Design a protein around this ligand. Structure first.
Ligand code: CLA
Ligand code: CLA
Ligand code: CLA
Ligand code: CLA
Ligand code: CLA
Ligand code: CLA
Ligand code: CLA
Ligand code: CLA
Ligand SMILES: CC1=C(C/C=C(\C)CCC[C@H](C)CCC[C@H](C)CCCC(C)C)C(=O)c2ccccc2C1=O
Ligand SMILES: CC1=C(C/C=C(\C)CCC[C@H](C)CCC[C@H](C)CCCC(C)C)C(=O)c2ccccc2C1=O
Ligand code: SF4
Ligand code: SF4
Ligand code: SF4
Lengths: 80, 61, 39, 146, 738, 144, 145
């Protein structure tokens, strides 16, 4: 599965979660921001790297990035 | 931090506004790690004109 | 009318005007002083 | 390419004698082109003909072969992946859904090339065609004329 | 129940928003901060569907835009006519056409560009035109440059009227949606009024002006001698002299004894031996036929009386067993979206211009037309290029509609729906038939070249070794040649000297001759058909994968135009229907280039020349040098490049210069077509460091072009370079050798 | 909320069948299935293409990959406030609740999801690639 | 999961053709290999250099021999002007009599390419005269290979 990594600047604006087309994300309770929410990526094996999330997250130095890895039947999302 | 509307100089290396100066919107009196809020007038590579920072990262200039 | 004047002072129009001026000048110059190479 | 072209022209003019022709046709590009390439091409494109052939037929052929390598590598360079991916998808549906063909089944699944892979294979095709055409032209000219 | 509906003063006339750039989009109107702002501003100025969503608003907009287009056309036409009036050797060419060459564009005696003022004859200097306005005007009956002058004046006035009409029908009295929707009234009005009365008045003008004066010109009487059109109109005696029917007025027509009018309503067929044109009486009869046909056609649909048909009812009436609900709802889709109409119309339009090119080179209708081989070639290839472009645009806007304004609900079990269903089978089939044709057709040529360069021409593919014969085409030609004896007994000749027959020549120059068809032509036709199918495949995928895909299931919401979907799932570059149209345009260019090459070589080699027999310009090298690629290159190209690469010191230096410039820009496009905007932005940033260090950084932020912008600029430059190169080459070569 | 249970016997919607249909992937390595219930009966847009009618009440469909279920989920969620959930169906039919799960969609926070794959730090605070070197496979400093 | 790319087990598990492609692609990127240690790396580059040396030696000895066999050297040394050097015997079942004849004219009794590789000038200049010595040199270079 392609690698994912949140950062303490996760403002919890959910735009990551609001974007992912693969449910690779979800919002948990947190404390470090006023929204008390930090994004969480518990299901890496279904991210295909479409990077809609990295397109979203408005932290100035991003907050939560994706990194490309090896492939499989489950991973690449190929119907055949 | 400095009172609202004050002008500080961003210094976070990664920050698109690095080594530049922006207007502080406000600072949270509470204990969040980046209570500083800094408007700008030159959007970054995604179209944003206001960024958040910790205390140290800025200099009121 | 002032709206119209500002429409004139828009950028592409002024660019066209300045370039027309420069080109007309150069052309008249090469007319009256044909084929100069020195001095 | 530029440096080798220049060397070759001046040395041709030296060996022949009308180095004045170089010093005159060599200060304007149309002179370069017409008098150096189109003028020196006449033999190669005649390496064979609807009449017969000669020792230069092979070089004319290699000329054309390089031109093809080049013009094909262009497709690599320009078209990108997702298009070909959609293609290959429709194709594999066809291959398995047509009768009596689904019998055999491959091992390694088909997909288009990764971006970098396609870029590299395209560059390869380009450069190969390039160097072939030029070498064939050069040798044909120098030998068939001297 | 149909009538006229309108609304008053919808939008004022003021410069207010003229001072407000980007007012049409609330997005852009908030101001620029980065470079790409300007690109976007220019890009979506006319994207009316993204401006707002009122059908009536977009409708009024496109109406006034039509008026603007019209005014522009009138302007350019008046310009042509005035140039012909004031700066031409037209009257000299009227005196002698056969040796005076048309010239209307003249250059100014400046830094050195006067050398282009070519001696075209008639004691005149300038530049040869190819448009053929001379032969056209002679065909019409223009003698005095006074006529050209007043014509230009009227054209300008008409352009002004068009602009005023646009302003009015947009700002003062704008129509309403249903009045835009009265489609049956629109078809009745168009087909009857426009075309019927056009052909009718055309027949009239031909008869009462262009027939007599051209009879006189071909009789050879002095040009200015010939009387004036209004005199021809007034004095029935003169027309009676010319054609003894005219003495009887109209009573014989009224009495249905139409045969007597046959004096100048002829059915000759063939050509006019003195001018190489078609018989003007024949064209007049033709236009009368078209006139009555279309005017009768303009009485089809019902508008305000039960008589006439209902398009939607007819549409639904046609349903099939294999098809389900059939044609239901199409009347809706068409009565509701501009883009469907635009797609259909562009497709038909492009096809029609192609047919125009073919028919026109086939049966030259103008006097002294067949002579200028340069003019023939130019007209043909120009109209062909235009047709190709129109057809590609048809495909583009088709896919655009399909993405944007389609609705699934209205069309449950539609022809459209089931097509969308079995799209996969369709595309796979097309793929295979294409690759088959590619294989066979092109491998033939490679096999030929290998059998040649190897030293065994015995085993090539020509008219000499193993043969291939367009038997069908030869058969059809035979039959159209032998037709008039039995098929059209009242036809006095074949409708084209290409069906077979004698040779008509004028001024020592061939005007037509029966055309041979060889194994060469077989193979060339098949290459044509292959590349055509390939282009069609590209565009059909572009439209059938518009909404979604087995790869991207949400393609629809992402809009018609977008770079990719990121490197996700293996890299998604170039997946939009916009990119489909991109590549389709590429292959269209390739195909059209090849087809005009075919045409040019066939003409030059085996039709053209001068009579002694005939002396073909290349003497017929075609049918043996056109079935090998090396032969192609050398004997045709590398050959005919002569005059274009030695055109210096002459009025043809411009052609060589443009040849060079076109090569240049064509290559320049490749940097765009290959680079990647990230690198550009990085270098931009270093440049900004440089500038800013001097405190000269611009207030507008510099941003590298958008991805699609890079793609579009690349394709535009490339196409420009290629087509300009071939254009310059064609013109220089044919004008030199003809 | 409790995990639902895939009832294989659910009325499939009104659809004439299209090309995006069955492959052998189901008999080879994996495949998927979705479910929901509609308020009224209505027509809608098949993701893989074609027109289909949702049946008033429960409905069941079959998709190979996962993003298709995602997409139709989004559609029903947005256009009629509808709420589906789905199931990865393994080679040997090992049903797996792919939808619902948390009981509540991750758009809204929910106590119980443990903050995962998170680094309480910035990204400029990662180490140079010179130091991650010499591993049996190639690691990016970003992971450490 | 087939042992395709060995050094890269992840790819070795890839069920797509990109397995084959990239396994070919990264063959020699020894830094990016499995269990790569420094002394390992070094001894690997060491074997690599050996390989390169052997290849180059084989190349040179092969050109030596092909000349020594099918060249026009011992005639060439006589007239260094009107003797063009023979590259290597041409053989092809496709070539017709025209090509054979045309290709035959340029060297001797049989179609041949005309080497343009300066080796003739070089070797004769260094003191190479007779085919015997060219055979000797070739075989000795192969020994070193
Ligand atoms: C960029 C290089 C360059 C330079 C340095 C010059 C220099 C000159 N040009 Mg120009 N010229 C150039 C490119 C250049 N030209 C190009 C690209 C064009 C085509 C658009 C021309 C076309 C041109 C003409 C037609 C003439 C000049 C002339 C001149 C003189 C102008 C004072 C001078 C010798 C004039 C002159 O008198 O030259 C001796 C002259 O006759 N130039
Ligand atoms: C159709 C478009 C068109 C184009 C491309 C040109 C192009 C040209 N015109 Mg213009 N011209 C046009 C329409 C056009 N004209 C119209 C509509 C009029 C009527 C007002 C004129 C009347 C006109 C005159 C009277 C003259 C030009 C001239 C010219 C040349 C320099 C300006 C240039 C070749 C000049 C020229 O060619 O001088 C020799 C010149 O004197 N034009
Ligand atoms: C000088 C005369 C004039 C003036 C002042 C305006 C003024 C305006 N026109 Mg324009 N317009 C005019 C003539 C004029 N138009 C003409 C001749 C036509 C017909 C070709 C149009 C067709 C037209 C359209 C179709 C549209 C405008 C629009 C506009 C607006 C911005 C431009 C503004 C109200 C735009 C508008 O309404 O923006 C709100 C718009 O959609 N005009
Ligand atoms: C059936 C189709 C048809 C055909 C074969 C022709 C054939 C011709 N038309 Mg066209 N023409 C047609 C329909 C057709 N026309 C219609 C429907 C109209 C009325 C709108 C016209 C109006 C028209 C005009 C006004 C003129 C032609 C002319 C021409 C010539 C241009 C090619 C050629 C004789 C030209 C001509 O006859 O020149 C001598 C010309 O000036 N046509
Ligand atoms: C469509 C345009 C048109 C127009 C404006 C006119 C106009 C005229 N025609 Mg008619 N005419 C036309 C087409 C037209 N005609 C056609 C197509 C035919 C063939 C059916 C004729 C055949 C014809 C004849 C035979 C005569 C006229 C005549 C006339 C004049 C008296 C009526 C008048 C100037 C009369 C006239 O004055 O002829 C000189 C006359 O005798 N016309
Ligand atoms: C009949 C002429 C015509 C008209 C009225 C339009 C109208 C339009 N085109 Mg264009 N277009 C046309 C022909 C035409 N096009 C042709 C012949 C081509 C092929 C080169 C295209 C290809 C094309 C593309 C690819 C695009 C447009 C776009 C557009 C829109 C913005 C400009 C606008 C509705 C742009 C748009 O916004 O489309 C939605 C766009 O992306 N057109
Ligand atoms: C794809 C189209 C095509 C077709 C229909 C043919 C047709 C033929 N080829 Mg083939 N050939 C082709 C392309 C093609 N070739 C190409 C691209 C290279 C060659 C190279 C080639 C050779 C070298 C030979 C043939 C031969 C032949 C003949 C019998 C097989 C026949 C004329 C054989 C033959 O009969 O030669 C006389 C033969 O020896 N071809
Ligand atoms: C390393 C370079 C090299 C290359 C590229 C070739 C290439 C070739 N050799 Mg070989 N050859 C080489 C070295 C090489 N040889 C060496 C080192 C020897 C010494 C034993 C030979 C001895 C040899 C013989 C004896 C023959 C070839 C022949 C051939 C050709 C058919 C196999 C082929 C073109 C054959 C040939 O000449 O075919 C035309 C042939 O009969 N080679
Ligand atoms: C045509 C095309 C394809 C489709 C082509 C593919 C998948 C490869 C087709 C390979 C054919 C079937 C055979 C390859 C022939 C080579 C000569 C093999 C060389 C093997 C070496 C070991 C010598 C892409 O995948 C692609 C990806 C990204 C950008 C552009 C393109 C692109 O243009
Ligand atoms: C060269 C290149 C660039 C760089 C080129 C750019 C940014 C265009 C530059 C346009 C002009 C030259 C600059 C702006 C001109 C304006 C009229 C401003 C006024 C300038 C005065 C001199 C008049 C890209 O941005 C790019 C993006 C995507 C794919 C390929 C490429 C690509 O190939
Ligand atoms: S790459 Fe981004 S958008 Fe794609 S699945 Fe992962 S987090 Fe979601
Ligand atoms: S990473 Fe960005 S998008 Fe995701 S929760 Fe944090 S602030 Fe929102
Ligand atoms: S920028 Fe280019 S390479 Fe990168 S994801 Fe977009 S289309 Fe693909």
């Amino acid at each position: 599965a392609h690698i994912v990594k949140i950062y303490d600047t996760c403002i919890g604006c959910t735009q990551c979660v609001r974007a992912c087309p693969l449910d690779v994300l979800e919002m948990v309770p947190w404390d470090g921001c006023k929204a008390s929410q930090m994004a969480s990526a518990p299901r890496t094996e279904d991210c295909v790297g479409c990077k809609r999330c990295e397109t979203a997250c408005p932290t100035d130095f991003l907050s939560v990035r994706v990194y490309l890895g090896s492939e499989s039947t489950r991973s690449m999302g190929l119907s055949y | 931090g400095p009172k609202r509307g004050s002008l500080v100089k961003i210094l976070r290396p990664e920050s698109y506004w690095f080594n530049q100066v922006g207007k502080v919107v406000s600072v949270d009196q509470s204990g969040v790690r980046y209570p500083v809020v800094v408007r700008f007038e030159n959007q970054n590579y995604a179209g944003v004109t206001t960024n958040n920072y910790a205390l140290d990262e800025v200099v009121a200039a | 009318m002032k709206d119209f004047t500002t429409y004139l002072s828009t950028a592409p129009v002024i660019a066209t005007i300045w370039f027309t001026f420069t080109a007309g000048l150069l052309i008249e110059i090469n007319r009256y002083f044909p084929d100069p190479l020195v001095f | 390419g530029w440096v080798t072209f220049y060397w070759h022209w001046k040395h041709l003019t030296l060996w022949q004698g009308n180095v004045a022709q170089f010093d005159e046709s060599s200060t304007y590009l149309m002179g370069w082109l017409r008098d150096y390439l189109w003028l020196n091409s006449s033999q190669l494109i005649n390496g064979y003909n609807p009449f017969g052939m000669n020792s230069l037929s092979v070089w004319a052929w290699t000329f054309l072969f390089g031109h093809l390598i080049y013009a094909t590598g262009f497709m690599f360079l320009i078209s990108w992946r997702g298009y070909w991916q959609e293609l290959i998808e429709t194709l594999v549906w066809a291959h398995e859904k047509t009768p009596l063909a689904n019998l055999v089944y491959w091992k390694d699944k088909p997909v288009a090339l990764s971006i970098v892979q396609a870029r590299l294979v395209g560059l390869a095709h380009f450069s190969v065609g390039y160097i072939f055409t030029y070498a064939a032209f050069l040798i044909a000219s120098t030998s068939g004329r001297f | 129940k149909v009538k006229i509906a309108v609304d008053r003063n919808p939008v004022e006339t003021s410069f207010e928003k003229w001072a407000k750039p980007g007012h049409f989009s609330r997005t852009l109107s908030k101001g620029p901060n980065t470079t790409t702002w300007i690109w976007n501003l220019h890009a979506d100025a006319h994207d009316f569907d993204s401006h707002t969503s009122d059908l009536e608003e977009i409708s009024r907009k496109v109406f006034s835009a039509h008026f603007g287009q019209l005014g522009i056309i009138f302007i350019w036409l008046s310009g042509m006519y005035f140039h012909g009036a004031r700066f031409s050797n037209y009257e000299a060419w009227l005196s002698d056409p056969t040796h005076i060459k048309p010239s209307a564009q003249v250059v100014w005696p400046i830094v050195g560009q006067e050398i282009l003022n070519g001696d075209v004859g008639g004691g005149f200097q300038g530049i040869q035109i190819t448009s053929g306005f001379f032969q056209l005007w002679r065909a019409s009956g223009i003698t005095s440059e006074l006529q050209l002058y007043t014509t230009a004046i009227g054209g300008l006035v008409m352009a002004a009227a068009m602009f005023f009409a646009g302003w009015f029908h947009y700002h003062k009295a704008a129509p309403k949606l249903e009045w835009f929707q009265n489609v049956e009234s629109m078809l009745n009005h168009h087909l009857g009024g426009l075309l019927g009365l056009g052909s009718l008045a055309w027949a009239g003008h031909q008869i009462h002006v262009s027939l007599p004066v051209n009879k006189l010109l071909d009789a050879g009487v002095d040009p200015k001698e010939i009387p004036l059109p209004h005199d021809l109109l007034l004095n029935r005696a003169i027309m009676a002299d010319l054609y003894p029917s005219f003495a009887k007025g109209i009573a014989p027509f009224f009495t249905l004894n139409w045969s007597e009018y046959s004096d100048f309503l002829t059915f000759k067929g063939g050509l006019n031996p003195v001018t190489g044109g078609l018989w003007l009486s024949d064209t007049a009869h033709h236009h009368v036929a078209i006139a009555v046909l279309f005017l009768v056609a303009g009485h089809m649909y019902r508008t305000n009386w039960g008589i006439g048909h209902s398009m939607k009812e007819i549409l639904e009436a046609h349903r099939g067993p294999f098809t389900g609900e059939g044609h239901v709802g199409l009347y809706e889709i068409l009565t509701t979206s501009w883009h469907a109409q635009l797609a259909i119309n562009l497709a038909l339009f492009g096809s029609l211009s192609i047919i125009v090119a073919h028919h026109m080179y086939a049966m030259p209708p103008y006097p002294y037309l067949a002579t200028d081989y340069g003019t023939q070639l130019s007209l043909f290839t120009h109209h062909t290029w235009i047709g190709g472009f129109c057809i590609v645009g048809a495909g583009a806007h088709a896919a655009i509609f399909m993405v944007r304004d389609y609705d699934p609900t209205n069309n449950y079990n539609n022809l459209l729906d089931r097509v969308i269903r079995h799209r996969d089978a369709i595309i796979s089939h097309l793929n295979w038939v294409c690759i088959f044709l590619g294989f066979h057709s092109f491998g033939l040529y490679i096999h030929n070249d290998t059998m040649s360069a190897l030293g065994r021409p015995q085993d090539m593919f020509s008219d000499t070794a193993i043969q291939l014969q367009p038997v069908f085409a030869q058969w059809i030609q035979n039959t159209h040649f032998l037709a008039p004896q039995l098929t059209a007994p009242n036809a006095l000749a074949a409708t084209s000297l290409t069906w077979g027959g004698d040779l008509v020549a004028v001024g020592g120059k061939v005007a037509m001759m029966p055309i041979s068809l060889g194994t060469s032509d077989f193979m060339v036709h098949h290459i044509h058909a292959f590349t055509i199918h390939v282009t069609v495949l590209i565009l059909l995928k572009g439209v059938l994968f518009a909404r979604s895909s087995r790869l991207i299931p949400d393609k629809a919401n992402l809009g018609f135009r977008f770079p990719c979907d990121g490197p996700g799932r293996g890299g998604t570059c170039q997946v939009s229907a916009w990119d489909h149209v991109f590549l389709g345009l590429f292959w269209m260019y390739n195909s059209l280039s090849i087809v005009i090459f075919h045409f040019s070589w066939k003409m030059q080699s085996d039709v053209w020349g001068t009579v002694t027999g005939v002396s073909h310009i290349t003497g017929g090298n075609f049918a043996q040098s056109a079935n090998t690629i090396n032969g192609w290159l050398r004997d045709f190209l590398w050959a005919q490049s002569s005059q274009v690469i030695q055109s210096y010191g002459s009025a043809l230096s411009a052609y060589g210069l443009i040849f060079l410039g076109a090569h240049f820009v064509w290559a320049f496009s490749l940097m765009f077509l290959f680079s990647g905007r990230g690198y550009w932005q990085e270098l931009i940033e270093s440049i900004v460091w440089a500038h800013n260090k001097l405190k000269v950084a611009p207030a507008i932020q510099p941003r590298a072009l958008s991805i699609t912008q890079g793609r579009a600029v690349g394709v535009a430059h490339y196409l420009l370079g290629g087509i300009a190169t071939t254009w310059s080459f064609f013109l220089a070569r044919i004008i030199s050798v003809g | 909320w409790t995990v639902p249970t895939l009832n294989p016997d659910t009325p499939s919607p009104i659809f004439g069948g299209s090309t995006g249909g069955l492959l052998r992937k189901a008999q080879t390595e994996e495949f998927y299935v979705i479910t929901w219930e509609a308020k009224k009966e209505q027509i809608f847009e098949m993701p893989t293409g074609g027109a289909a009618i949702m049946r008033q009440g429960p409905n069941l469909l079959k998709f190979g990959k996962k993003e298709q279920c995602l997409a139709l989920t989004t559609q029903l969620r947005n256009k009629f406030k509808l709420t589906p959930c789905f199931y990865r169906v393994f080679p040997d039919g090992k049903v797996q609740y792919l939808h619902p799960a948390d009981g509540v969609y991750p758009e809204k926070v929910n106590a119980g999801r443990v903050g995962a794959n998170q680094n309480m730090r910035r990204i400029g605070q990662n180490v140079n690639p010179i130091k991650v070197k010499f591993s049996g496979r190639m690691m990016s400093p970003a992971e450490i | 999961t087939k042992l395709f790319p060995k050094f890269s087990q992840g790819l070795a598990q890839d069920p797509t053709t990109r397995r084959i492609w990239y396994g070919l692609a990264m063959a020699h990127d020894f830094e990016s290999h499995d269990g790569m240690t420094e002394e390992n790396l070094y001894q690997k580059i060491f074997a690599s250099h050996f390989g390169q040396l052997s290849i180059i030696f084989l190349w040179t000895s092969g050109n030596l021999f092909h000349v020594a066999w099918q060249g026009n050297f011992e005639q060439w040394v006589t007239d260094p002007v009107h003797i063009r050097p023979i590259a290597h015997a041409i053989w092809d079942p496709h070539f017709g009599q025209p090509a054979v004849e045309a290709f035959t004219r340029g060297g001797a009794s049989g179609p041949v390419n005309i080497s343009t590789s300066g080796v003739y000038q070089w070797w004769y200049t260094i003191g190479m005269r007779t085919n015997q010595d060219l055979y000797v040199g070739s075989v000795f270079l192969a020994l070193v290979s």
